[PDB]
Amino acid sequence: WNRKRISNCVADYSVLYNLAPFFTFKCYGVSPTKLNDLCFTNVYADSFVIRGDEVRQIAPGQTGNIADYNYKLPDDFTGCVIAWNSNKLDSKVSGNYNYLYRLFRKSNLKPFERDISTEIYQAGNKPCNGVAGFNCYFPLRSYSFRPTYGVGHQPYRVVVLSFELLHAPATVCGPKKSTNLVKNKCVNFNFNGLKGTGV
């Protein structure tokens, strides 16, 4: 997953909750409706295809096949997860085999870690890493996506946004804009999503 660095721009979050390529949502830490007034320092985005029954493991700190073996989310995840019913682009008749998923691995994963190793893991006592067969099951196993599947088995084009609520210089902000500065007067203020009253 390419960690695309989103910074120094205005993010219109109200765009991304309307249409077919962005239809099913879950959010943690920040309400998605009040995203248009808040700001973040950096937001890191990823895009990927995973079967719909496995999208349930895309959650803060949860376990599973793609969790332990493909990608772990942090358990303090402040962000939103955006999916898409992607039968038309990622599924073909009698299987589409362009996406690969891990079912066994030597190690449990740490959040936001990446491993592109295709070494065949030792399921049993038989030696592996070059050997194929029993006790040397293949690491990269496809789900064979078809448009005739039920809803759980469908390929889902899922986008993950990771927001940073750090009190650093925030370069990503919503569609709202600023006003003039007033000094030495009891006024209401709002600074990059921080609402308060004072002189």
Next chain:
Amino acid sequence: NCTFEYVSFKNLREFVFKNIDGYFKIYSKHTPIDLPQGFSALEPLVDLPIGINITRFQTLLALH
């Protein structure tokens, strides 16, 4: 494969490297002067989410 790239005695330079949640965090300090006795806190410089598992390190030297 280069998934990420970035381009920006007398003196003592201090560095601190640590890994939290894949975010590689870098702290730094410079001063002119084994370890001389003193106190100076390091300031955060570069944060970077490579997510690379790191267990060993090695420093680099200069040759003409």
Next chain:
Amino acid sequence: DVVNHNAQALNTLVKQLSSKFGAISSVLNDIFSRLDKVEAEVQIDRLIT
């Protein structure tokens, strides 16, 4: 000791606003801005309690 008891009681009353009491943040307006009102009043409820 009377003066120090008064100052210590007032100061200990001051720093317990920093104590989050199981809520997400010490500052109320951050909870109001980050979340909508329904879970926000639960977090403020823990803070006020």
